[PDB]
Structure formats: C-alpha cells, structure tokens
Design a protein around this motif. Structure first.
Motif, short mmCIF file in Angstrom:
data_model
loop_
_atom_site.label_atom_id
_atom_site.label_comp_id
_atom_site.label_asym_id
_atom_site.label_seq_id
_atom_site.Cartn_x
_atom_site.Cartn_y
_atom_site.Cartn_z
N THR A 5 0.82 -1.21 0.00
CA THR A 5 0.00 0.00 0.00
C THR A 5 0.85 1.26 0.00
N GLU A 6 1.99 1.25 0.69
CA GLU A 6 2.70 2.52 0.70
C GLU A 6 3.97 2.51 -0.14
N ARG A 7 4.21 1.43 -0.90
CA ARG A 7 5.22 1.45 -1.93
C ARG A 7 4.64 1.69 -3.32
N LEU A 8 3.32 1.89 -3.41
CA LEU A 8 2.69 2.21 -4.69
C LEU A 8 3.14 3.59 -5.17
N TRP A 221 -7.70 6.71 -4.90
CA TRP A 221 -7.83 6.18 -6.25
C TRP A 221 -6.61 5.35 -6.61
N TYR A 222 -6.86 4.28 -7.36
CA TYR A 222 -5.84 3.53 -8.08
C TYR A 222 -6.17 3.60 -9.56
N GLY A 223 -5.18 3.95 -10.37
CA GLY A 223 -5.38 4.13 -11.79
C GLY A 223 -4.39 3.33 -12.61
N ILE A 224 -4.83 2.96 -13.81
CA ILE A 224 -4.07 2.15 -14.74
C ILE A 224 -3.88 2.98 -16.01
N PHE A 265 -10.54 -6.15 -5.88
CA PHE A 265 -9.29 -6.82 -5.60
C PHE A 265 -8.17 -5.79 -5.48
N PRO A 266 -7.17 -6.04 -4.64
CA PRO A 266 -6.17 -5.02 -4.35
C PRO A 266 -5.19 -4.86 -5.50
N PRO A 267 -4.58 -3.69 -5.62
CA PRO A 267 -3.56 -3.49 -6.66
C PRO A 267 -2.37 -4.45 -6.60
N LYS A 268 -2.09 -5.09 -5.46
CA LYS A 268 -0.93 -5.98 -5.40
C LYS A 268 -1.07 -7.14 -6.38
N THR A 269 -2.30 -7.65 -6.56
CA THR A 269 -2.50 -8.70 -7.55
C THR A 269 -2.02 -8.26 -8.92
#
Ligand SMILES: O=C(O)CCC(=O)C(=O)O
Ligand code: NI
Ligand SMILES: [Zn+2]
Ligand SMILES: [Zn+2]
Length: 472
Positions: A5-8, A221-224, A265-269
C-alpha cells in the motif's frame, strides 16, 4: 500483508497558478504528454469557492434530499437477486443527517469520528475487504444536482472548472450532442462514507472523467494507464480463473460483466503481474482526471461529497473507435453517436483553415489528425460500400437522410451517414451487412438513406487525405 500500500507510486500532481488554470480541457492538453502515461492525475485547484458545498446544497437549492444505494463490501459473496435488493434498500437523507450517520458509524468503529491518517484507513479498507464482518455500506452515487455555487462572485463556481460548464467547452467533443446524457453532458453528485467504494472499471465509451472533491474525508484512487488496459484485462481473466480474484465462475460472458461479479481486488494482484498502478489520494479542493481507457478503482475514507462528469476531446477519437468495436462485438447499443461526432468535428475543421494552422499545441494537433483520419476512413468505407450496394441492384430506393443518428437493428452500431431502411421502418441496418442475406418480414425492397451533403464530405475527405500527418 499490505506492505504494497505505501510502496505504490503516486500519480502526477499538478499545482497550476490561477493564470495557468485556464479551462480544464486546454490545461489537460498542455499536460497530456506526461499525464496520459499514467492514466490518472491530480490537479490542485488554485481557486477557492466563496460558498462551500454544504451552503450551496442548503441555501441555493430547495429541500435538497437524496436516496442512497446499499453497496456490499464483498461483491462476489452475493447472487444476482441480492444485488437488485441491495440497490433499492437505500434510505432518503439530508446532507446533514447523512453526514451525522456516517460520523456516528465511524466513531463506533474507531471510538472517535476524527479523520484518521491516510495509510491507516487504506490498510483498514483492504483488511476489511479481505476478512471483515461489515456486510454493506451506504452511498449516494449518480445524484443529480451540483455543489458548485451559482453566485456570481464565486471564483470556483464562475470558472470554467465548474463542472457544469465542461461539456460545452470549445474543446469538448460532446458539446456537439443535442441530447442530454446524465454524467456525460451534466455532472453528477457523489456522497460517500467510510469504505464506500468504486470498483475496478473504465468509463462508457472510454471517455475521460474529471472529479472534484467539495468537502470531507480523503478519497483514494488507483489508476491504470490506458496503454495497459489489455494487460489489465488479461491479468484479471487469469486471476479470476486461478481464483486469485474471488468471484463466481465466469461462464464466458464479457469482461465488463465479469468485473461486476468480483470482490474488489487489491492493486498488489496487478503489481505481481507487472501492470502499472498509480495512487492518488484526493482531498477537498482537488480534481482527479482519468484518461481514456484508464482502469480505476477507489474508496472513501469517511463522509465526503464530490462531483464528476465525463468528457472527450480530439485525442479521444481513436479510443472511442475501439469502444465502438467492442460495443458492436457485444451487440450492445453504444452510448455516443460516434460517426456523427467524427463527421461534425471533421467538417468544422474542413470549414476553417487559419484558426488551426497558426497556434496549435501538440496534443490538440494530434487530436485534429485523429479526427481527420477517422473521417477519411469512414468516408472511404462508406464510398466502397455504396459502390457495391449500387452494383448489386438490391437497394433500389434512395432517400436524402435528414435524421439524427439511428441504431442498426442487427449490430446496434450508430448510423449517421447512411443506413438501409426496410419496408416497415422497424428493421433498418447499417451498411456493413450483406443485403442479399437480409430476410426481413416486411419485404425485400430496400431504401438507402444517405446524408444530404455526402459530396461535400467526400471533398473534405479527399483534401484531408493529402495533408501531412493524415496517414492511413
Ligand atoms: O466519484 C466516484 O466515486 C466515482 C469516480 C469515477 O469513477 C470517475 O469519475 O470516473
Ligand atoms: Ni470512473
Ligand atoms: Zn449493423
Ligand atoms: Zn421492416
């Protein structure tokens, strides 16, 4: 284990001065070469409102009230009936009483209602998704109404970054629509509470979205990047299948639907499979922009109110095309009249040659080239299809077409330039279908409806054909 979460990496954050603020479409065109690589960016407003959101909702509107939807935290744990029930299980609230309900729920979870650090609540949200006992969360999406002040002195409300003005801006492609579309020609209000979320998705028609936060807690937000879209889908399809992502078995169908059946689902996947993800943590006074085809997901850290609208500019046209294809492949009515927007923008460019040549930006010029290219390809296909149609002798009728866009009865693609009408008016088809193979119950006489100025548009196309950068 949640270290990720905090290395993103964080998305780009822009802090324009007032004089650089301009209007959001011009500004986006200046920052596009960088920001578009990320799929999502943030823009700190240099303009403050004079009348804050709550005062707009209470004083500039009459008895403002809204109804919530009930959102399950783990989407995959519910069948299709329970989702229907969930949508309608909401409750009507005032702004103030929804705020107080959210704060009392927050205080019952954390002994105090005071906002907590961003990292803490991000980890809390994902651990709740993975093993929590809270079943649902209340939120008000897609509420119509606005928190931008209509008062004349308001620096924010009277700016072009007031999201009610966006769709009519000179660089807004959708300024040319004559119909209204909620969320597209008009913004919508969003009111959230702790852990209310938006699951992984892409806008309809691969439009841009712009979102302003008026007040309240942080929104993560998580973005691609748009460029990773296919990879995203590939990875998700594999991880749903390996049950890395919890859902019900797909049973084929379409990614748009399968996504609707997965627990967020979390961004780590996605990181584990090398698709880039960037984080934005948005606070009142900031805009978040997502780019065409940029997948995004996120959640609220507490009570919050935001406002969003979707839009397009010239550079969106290649993405719209791809979306139209998918719409056609899935046999679904598209959201936008793609052909009509192509033709209208292209004839506007053909009509003026000196406003554009002298002072254009790179992204604007690229959008102009994308419009001209789409137009040239459209006119070419239509010319060849019409030539074949004429030679077949199976379409004896010809009528000057003065309609708006019509929907094809077979593939549901939008038809602006031409369609083939039937004897009873209920089975029109676009020009992609073999007329000899149409078995229509109304008869076999077929009438081509062809837009009246087709020759002017062919001339515009032939001239664009020869311009540099229009390469086909
Ligand atoms: O406001 C929200 O929660 C949804 C944001 C979003 O999906 C968008 O603006 O594209
Ligand atoms: Ni969105
Ligand atoms: Zn069709
Ligand atoms: Zn018919």
């Amino acid at each position: 284990d949640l270290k990720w979460t905090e290395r993103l990496p964080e998305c780009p954050v822009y802090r324009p001065t007032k004089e650089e603020f301009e209007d959001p479409l011009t500004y986006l065109q200046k920052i596009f070469p960088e920001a578009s690589k990320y799929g999502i960016c943030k823009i700190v407003s240099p303009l403050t409102a004079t009348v804050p959101a709550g005062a707009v909702l209470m004083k500039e509107k009459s008895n403002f009230k809204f109804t919530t939807r009930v959102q399950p935290l783990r989407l995959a744990e519910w069948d299709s009936d329970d989702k229907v029930t969930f949508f309608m299980s909401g409750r009507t609230y005032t702004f103030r009483d929804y705020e107080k309900m959210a704060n009392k729920v927050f205080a019952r979870r954390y002994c105090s209602g005071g906002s907590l650090p961003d990292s803490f609540l991000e980890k809390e949200f994902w651990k709740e998704i993975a093993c929590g006992k809270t079943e649902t969360v209340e939120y008000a999406c897609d509420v119509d109404g606005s928190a931008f002040s209509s008062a004349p002195g308001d620096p924010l409300g009277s700016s072009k970054w007031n999201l009610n003005k966006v769709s009519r801006l000179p660089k807004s492609t959708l300024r040319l629509l004559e119909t209204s579309i909620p969320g597209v020609t008009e913004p919508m209000l969003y009111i959230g509470m702790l852990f209310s979320m938006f699951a992984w998705h892409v806008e309809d028609h691969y439009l841009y979205s712009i979102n302003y936060q008026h007040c309240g807690a942080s929104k993560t937000w998580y973005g691609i990047p748009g460029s990773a879209a296919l990879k995203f889908e590939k990875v998700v399809k594999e991880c749903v299948y390996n049950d890395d992502i919890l859902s019900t078995n797909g049973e084929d169908g379409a990614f748009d639907v399968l996504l609707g059946k997965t627990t967020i689902f979390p961004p780590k996947t996605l990181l584990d499979h090398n698709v880039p993800v960037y984080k934005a943590v948005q606070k009142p006074g900031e805009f978040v922009v997502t780019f065409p085809r940029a997948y995004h997901a996120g959640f609220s850290h507490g009570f919050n109110c935001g406002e969003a609208v979707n839009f397009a500019m010239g550079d969106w046209f290649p993405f719209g095309a791809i979306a139209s294809c998918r719409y056609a492949h899935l046999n679904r009515v598209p959201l936008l009249p793609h052909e009509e927007l192509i033709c209208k923008e292209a004839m506007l460019l053909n009509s003026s040659s000196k406003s554009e040549n002298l002072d254009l930006t790179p992204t604007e010029l690229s959008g102009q080239r994308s419009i001209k290219t789409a137009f040239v390809h459209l006119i070419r296909f239509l010319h060849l299809a019409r030539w074949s149609l004429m030679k077949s002798g199976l379409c004896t009728g010809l009528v000057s077409n003065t309609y708006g866009t019509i929907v094809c009865s077979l593939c549901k693609r939008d038809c602006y330039l031409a369609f083939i009408n039937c004897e009873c008016y209920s089975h029109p088809v676009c020009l992609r279908h073999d007329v000899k193979k149409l078995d229509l119950p109304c008869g076999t006489t077929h009438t081509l409806y062809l837009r009246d100025n087709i020759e002017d548009m062919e001339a515009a196309a032939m001239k664009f054909e020869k311009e540099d950068g229009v390469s086909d």
